[PDB]
Amino acid sequence: YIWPKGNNKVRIRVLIALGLLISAKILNVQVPFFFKQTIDSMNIAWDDPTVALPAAIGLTILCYGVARFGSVLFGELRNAVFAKVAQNAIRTVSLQTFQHLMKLDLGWHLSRQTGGLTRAMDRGTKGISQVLTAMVFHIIPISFEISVVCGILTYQFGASFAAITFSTMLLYSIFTIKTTAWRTHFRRDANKADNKAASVALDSLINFEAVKYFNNEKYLADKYNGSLMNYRDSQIKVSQSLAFLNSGQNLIFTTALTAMMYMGCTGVIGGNLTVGDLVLINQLVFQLSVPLNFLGSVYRDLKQSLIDMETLFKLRKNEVKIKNAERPLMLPENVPYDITFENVTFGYHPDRKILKNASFTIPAGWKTAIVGSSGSGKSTILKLVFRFYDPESGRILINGRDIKEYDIDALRKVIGVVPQDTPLFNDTIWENVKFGRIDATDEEVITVVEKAQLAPLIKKLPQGFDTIVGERGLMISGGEKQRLAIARVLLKNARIMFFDEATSALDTHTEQALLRTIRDNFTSGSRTSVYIAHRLRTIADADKIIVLDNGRVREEGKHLELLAMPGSLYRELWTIQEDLDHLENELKDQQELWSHPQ
Amino acid sequence: YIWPKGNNKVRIRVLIALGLLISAKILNVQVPFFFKQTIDSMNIAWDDPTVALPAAIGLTILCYGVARFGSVLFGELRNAVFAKVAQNAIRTVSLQTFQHLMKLDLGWHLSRQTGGLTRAMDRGTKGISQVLTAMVFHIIPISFEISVVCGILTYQFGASFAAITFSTMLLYSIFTIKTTAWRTHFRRDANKADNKAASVALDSLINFEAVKYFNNEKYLADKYNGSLMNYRDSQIKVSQSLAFLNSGQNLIFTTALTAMMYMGCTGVIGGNLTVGDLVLINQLVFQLSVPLNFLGSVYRDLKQSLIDMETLFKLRKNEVKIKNAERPLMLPENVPYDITFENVTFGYHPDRKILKNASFTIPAGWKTAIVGSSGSGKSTILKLVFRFYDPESGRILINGRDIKEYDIDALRKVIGVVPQDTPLFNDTIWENVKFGRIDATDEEVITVVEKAQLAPLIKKLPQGFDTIVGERGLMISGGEKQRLAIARVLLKNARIMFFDEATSALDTHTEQALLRTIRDNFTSGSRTSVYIAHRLRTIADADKIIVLDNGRVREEGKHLELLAMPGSLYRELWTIQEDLDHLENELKDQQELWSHPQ
């Protein structure tokens, strides 16, 4: 909570805002004095009606002006000065939450709904410019002015007046709040009908044929009219409820101001009060109603913004599960890397073990394929090598060392990944290809697009390298996506390379073309390649194939050797998989015959 | 142009509001007088300081209160009274918009983005409560009070003052408006970056793995910060630029009131003005400052809300392309209907013909099947018979009469459709089944749910018949949906019946089970059934099969007769379709093998 103060005392400015806050209200309570004095200083002789105005009193009316203006200006300056404090505290919190969100472990990110975080770390900031704006633009200034106005009234007119001014505020408070909290249970019913009516309109626009296919039209028309009427009947109980707040509020003040003018006019009989003391006590108390209007819709907002600010704080509460230990290693500089699994048992969720006591090696410089049908758990190899997770039993070594003892950032730096479905950031294509290595020369980004065979996309594309792709942009093919991924990892130039089902591009012709550019760019050049696939035909040129079944290692060999091995599972998969490809292609040919006229 | 007056004595409320408006500004301009009188009628002898207060002025201060409060009250009463007129004007436009949109033609609905119509008739309604709230709650009342104050000033103080009041307003307007247009290009740059930072935060959360698989994180953290700093720096240049409006606005009034205190005090030298006329010319002029803060944030709304209201009105401008003619027919009473196509040529987009000079007969009481491979134009038969579109050439008759000559609603009322994809309204199932015929007894809906074999869905559903189905509810299967559709058309009980690809239920077992329920409910019962199908196997019991190819009628006969006819297209299609069914079920068995471990 709070803690805008610690070090970096450039936020001394908070005093200046606080100071400017005082020196704007002081200037306010002083405005009616200049009105009183300017009125009494004109209640005199004037027997010469051609006399000029005493500059001694032309001054008092210049002072009135420059104190009225002084009050607003020193207040508006309080705001913009403190705005530098508010917007800064958010920019600092919004970053620190962002950075910590990405220090969190992957399991966390997959448990948490992303929207509930996008709402949290957005409505969490807006809940801060509502607790400080409440405090500084409203609470303190109206709390001070009440002190000073009731103080001044006490000394210069007696507690007779003070007791009722302060009372007037307290009644205005516990009426405004208690009436406004009574009317939020009205807007919450009002837009409710708006929504009801909204869907009936939308259902009738989406299901336009369906309503046409049946009678209706009239049926849905006054189905609407109903929801439309229930909204009117609710929107009226807003405008009406507003009057009763707006009118009740004026009554509380208007009697306070009417009863005091009276009280004032009795002290004019008793010679205790001048006639300017009437303008004084009226115009003095009236200055307390203006900022009382705002601080009425709040209260609840304060309640809301109090927790939404708390939720946003909890985000940084969440601790980091995958940490590297004391004295972490970087290690080996200029060697090829090998990966090895020692009795690795792992799963997400303790009831379902996925990798069961698996042991194998991914030798250095080789293209090793890890295959298996469903449930094999080849599906989890990368996550473990990349230390997104840690294995329940057994351990995982790179070059004889458990990756746990490695600098979790150093480790991840030497692994490049071409994922099954590549993600597009909402940016330019160029900035997506560049996403692989930030410090890349402009040409590096060009070559790498050429090598990937990505050129024909930028040529087909009107707006070229600067085009916007992404969830909110121009969707490109799976082929062009996977192609971009090849580009990215080419820039990253990692030593260990994963192709995690890189070609489940749901069309045969594209996988075909894709595998070729993969074999051109990633051929045994002292990089250690791991291909995770389920279509065996696409990894048959692998130096080593490790077949998993139900989470355990069943066979290991080369393609021709594995097929020839009697009673192997590899040949069983190969056979099914093959029959499948024949079938689905026999099927596609026949869909064609029935695709066109004859 | 917005029509608050027409042929309904709801316009008395419009008079009352204007009146309540008048008598609210009148009650206001009297507020400074009763203050003046309480000032002058207390500037007297009082040589006796124990005297009671003269009731002749006890009335003068009561008049002050009950004229202050009366001013607000009659103003708040003006609001809630006119809200009834505003809220009625929306409810009327939303309904007529809705009704007319459904007189619109099917192609129209398919070119228009449906959300953008939902936005149109939303931002168009909200664009009325912003042009009506402007006029009645701000523009008119502040212009009347300007006049009355300028009238009063000239009458009781001379045009010297009036010349500065009206000018102060004229200055205040042509400042506020001209200043605010300079600063909206600041808040439009604030949320611009907020949106950029919005995507950077979201992208770093959707693609959390992608950013992890690469270097970055730091790169994406300050890619955020840039937009965060660009927002800070912008929201500050909003807060600053706001103080300058609030201050420039106070300057305009404070000099206006300070110079009037001068001008006021020189008329006190000349013995023309009392000391209470200082409060009068002050407080009366000042009371024009209160609502001027509001009439500033407007103006721009007026421009937006002017066109958003115009775009919404264009919706009723849109002409009805398929209209029924002068003196339309209803006709044939208690006969079965036959449909006949004569030289019908039709397409969407005139250059690309779908149905080409097709003529055939769908005889009455028979089951007629219209089959053909892709491009056949069987896809357009329903749409033409239902008069969603009109054919370019040729005509379509029901019982010898051109369907164009029928009352388009009488026509459609005798056709029931079981479509390929059934839609769900956001309501209960019961209300979705009842949607077929509205005035159906609750029991009819039961029999129809039973006959359709819908019972087991409602038993399986938690909340029974009252369960909420739909896009924002509980989704049901392709099977159950088509099952619902049969229920619907059963309640409608139309004399012509269409099954437009009813059974492309992407599973074998379901097409089968459905096809049975159809054959039990719909067997030649002097209802003429048209089956549009591509699985010929599912219409072999048809009385007539009409085979179309490339938009023209190629063969017509019964099943056995068509297969046996030499060189027929029917046998060809039958053959392709068999092999296809063989393939896709062979493919299903084989995919099963690769779904589970081995």
Contact B423 A207 (CB under 8 A): yes
> Measured between alpha carbons, how far is B420 from B432 in angstroms, rounded to an integer?
17
**B136 secondary structure, DSSP code:** I
Contact by Cβ (8 Å): B211, A388: no
What is the residue whose two structure tokens read 């068995």?
B589
Minimal-distance CA residue of chain B relative to A419: B210
B283 and B403 fall within a common domain: no
Q: Which helix (H) or strand (E) holds A233?
A: helix A218-269
Check if B198 contacts A (Cβ < 8 Å): yes
> Measured between alpha carbons, how far is A167 from A161 in angstroms, rounded to an integer?
10
> Measured between alpha carbons, how far is A413 from A433 in angstroms, rounded to an integer?
18
Chain A environment of B373 (Cβ under 8 Å)? 593-598
Contact A109 B77 (CB under 8 A): no
A398 and A519 fall within a common domain: yes
| CB-count exposure of residue B326 (10 Å: 0-12, 13-18, 19+) | exposed
| CB-count exposure of residue B60 (10 Å: 0-12, 13-18, 19+) | buried
> Measured between alpha carbons, how far is A78 from A22 in angstroms, rounded to an integer?
9
A211 and A285 fall within a common domain: yes
Contact by Cβ (8 Å): B228, B249: no
> Measured between alpha carbons, how far is A81 from A87 in angstroms, rounded to an integer?
11
What's the full length of chain B, in residues?
Answer: 598
Minimal-distance CA residue of chain B relative to A437: B215
Contact A84 B236 (CB under 8 A): yes
Check if A423 contacts B (Cβ < 8 Å): yes
Give me the residues of A, 293-352, that contact B with CB < 8 A. none
Alpha-carbon distances of B437 from A117, A311, B434, B491, B493, rounded to whole Å: 46, 50, 6, 5, 9
CA atoms within 13 A on the CB side of B49: 6
Contact by Cβ (8 Å): A548, A376: yes
User: Which of B57, B224, B572 shows the shortest C-beta gap to A98?
Assistant: B224
Contact by Cβ (8 Å): B89, B132: yes
- B454: phi then psi, degrees, rounded to nearest 5: -95, -15
Alpha-carbon distances of B442 from B58, B422, B465, rounded to whole Å: 71, 22, 11
Q: Where does B452-532 have alpha helices with state H?
A: 455-460, 478-492, 508-521
Alpha-carbon distances of B135 from A241, B10, B269, rounded to whole Å: 21, 19, 42
A348 and A471 fall within a common domain: yes
> Measured between alpha carbons, how far is B429 from B488 in angstroms, rounded to an integer?
11
B202 and B122 fall within a common domain: yes
Experimental technique of record: X-ray
**Helix, strand, or coil (residue B547):** strand
> Measured between alpha carbons, how far is A130 from A122 in angstroms, rounded to an integer?
13
Residue type at position A145: E
Domain residue limits at A598: 329-598
B273 and B341 fall within a common domain: no
> Measured between alpha carbons, how far is A576 from A572 in angstroms, rounded to an integer?
6
A305 and A363 fall within a common domain: no
Contact B228 A270 (CB under 8 A): no
Domain harbouring A426, CATH code: 3.40.50.300
Point out the domain boundary residue: A328, A363, A394: A328
Chain A environment of B270 (Cβ under 8 Å)? 49
What torsion do the CA atoms of A331, A337, A342, A347 make, to the nearest 10 degrees? 90
Domain harbouring A90, CATH code: 1.20.1560.10
Chain B environment of A213 (Cβ under 8 Å)? 386, 412, 415-417, 419
Contact A91 B416 (CB under 8 A): no
Contact by Cβ (8 Å): B36, B277: yes
Vertex B385: Cα angle to B380 and B389 (nearest 5): 65
B333 and B321 fall within a common domain: no
Question: Among residues A137, A134, A131, A135, which one has the least CA distance to residue A313?
Answer: A131
Check if B481 contacts A (Cβ < 8 Å): no
Alpha-carbon distances of A24 from A63, A305, B267, B581, rounded to whole Å: 14, 28, 32, 85
Q: Which helix (H) or strand (E) holds B396?
A: strand B393-398
Point out the domain boundary residue: B328, B362, B378: B328
Asked whether the CA dihedral A500, A504, A508, A511 is positive or negative, the reply is negative
Q: Where does A120-217 have alpha helices with state H?
A: 120-123, 132-134, 140-157, 159-206, 208-213
Resolution (angstroms) equals: 3.1
**Helix, strand, or coil (residue B402):** strand
| CB-count exposure of residue B475 (10 Å: 0-12, 13-18, 19+) | exposed
> Measured between alpha carbons, how far is A562 from A581 in angstroms, rounded to an integer?
20
Q: Which residues contact B584 (CB under 8 A, 6 or more apart)?
A: A587
Question: Among residues B252, B57, B268, B66, which one has the least CA distance to residue B165?
Answer: B252
Q: Which helix (H) or strand (E) holds A226?
A: helix A218-269
B97 and B149 fall within a common domain: yes
- A406: phi then psi, degrees, rounded to nearest 5: -90, 155
Q: Which helix (H) or strand (E) holds B345?
A: strand B339-346
What is the residue whose two structure tokens read 């290692």?
A553
What torsion do the CA atoms of B268, B273, B274, B275 make, to the nearest 10 degrees? -50
Alpha carbon A259 to chain centroid distance?
A: 53
| CB-count exposure of residue A326 (10 Å: 0-12, 13-18, 19+) | exposed
Residue type at position A419: P
Give me the residues of A, 212-271, that contact B with CB < 8 A. 212-217, 219-221, 224-225, 228-229, 231-232, 235-236, 238-240, 242-244, 246-247, 250-251, 254-255, 257-258, 261-262, 265-266, 268-271
User: Which of B101, B214, B415 shows the shortest C-beta gap to A205?
Assistant: B101
B324 and B425 fall within a common domain: no
B282 and B394 fall within a common domain: no
To 10 degrees, what angle do helices B115-123 and B55-101 make?
Answer: 160
Q: What is the DSSP string of B341-379?
A: EEEEEE-SSTTS-SEEEEEEEE-TTSEEEEE-STTSSGG
- B406: phi then psi, degrees, rounded to nearest 5: -90, 155
Tell me if A382 is assigned to a ligand binding site.
yes
What is the residue whose two structure tokens read 């093998």?
B593
Check if B585 contacts A (Cβ < 8 Å): no
The tokens for B42 are: 């207390």
**Helix, strand, or coil (residue A274):** coil
Long-range pairs for A217-226: beta carbons < 8 A, 24 or more residues apart: A217/B99, A217/B102, A219/B438, A220/B102, A221/B95, A221/B98, A221/B99, A221/B102, A224/A197, A224/A200, A224/B94, A224/B95, A224/B98, A225/B91, A225/B95
Minimal-distance CA residue of chain B relative to A490: B214
**A540 secondary structure, DSSP code:** T
Q: What is the DSSP string of B415-478?
A: EEEE-SS----SEEHHHHHGGG-TT--HHHHHHHHHHTT-HHHHHHSTTGGG-EESTTSB---H
**Helix, strand, or coil (residue B469):** strand
- β-strands B528-532, B367-371 pairing: parallel
Alpha-carbon distances of B306 from B94, B101, B184, B301, B313, rounded to whole Å: 17, 21, 18, 8, 11
How large is the greatest C-alpha to C-alpha distance in chain A, in angstroms?
Answer: 131
Point out the domain boundary residue: B275, B307, B328: B328
Q: Where does B319-433 have alpha helices with state H?
A: 381-385, 408-413, 429-433
B171 and B82 fall within a common domain: yes
How large is the greatest C-alpha to C-alpha distance in chain B, in angstroms?
Answer: 131
**Helix, strand, or coil (residue B518):** helix
Contact by Cβ (8 Å): B545, B570: yes
Tell me if A403 is assigned to a ligand binding site.
no
> Measured between alpha carbons, how far is B88 from A228 in angstroms, rounded to an integer?
9
Buried b (16+ CB within 10 A) or exposed e, A497-534: bbbbbbbebeeeebbeebbebbeebbeeeebbbbbbbb
Task: Tell me how many residue pairs between chain A and chain B have CB atoms under 8 A apart.
Answer: 383
Report chain A's C-alpha Rg in angstroms.
Answer: 38
**Helix, strand, or coil (residue B127):** coil
> Measured between alpha carbons, how far is A144 from A153 in angstroms, rounded to an integer?
14
User: Which of A39, A87, A436 shows the shortest C-beta gap to B278?
Assistant: A39
Minimal-distance CA residue of chain A relative to B497: A213
- B125: phi then psi, degrees, rounded to nearest 5: -75, -45
> Measured between alpha carbons, how far is B593 from B584 in angstroms, rounded to an integer?
15
Contact B198 A122 (CB under 8 A): yes
Counting the structural domains of chain B, the total is 2
> Measured between alpha carbons, how far is A248 from A551 in angstroms, rounded to an integer?
74
Check if A15 contacts B (Cβ < 8 Å): no
Q: Could you tell me the end-to-end alpha-carbon distance of chain B, in angstroms, rounded to an integer?
A: 76
Asked whether the CA dihedral A57, A59, A61, A64 is positive or negative, the reply is negative
> Measured between alpha carbons, how far is B517 from B379 in angstroms, rounded to an integer?
23
Residue type at position A75: G
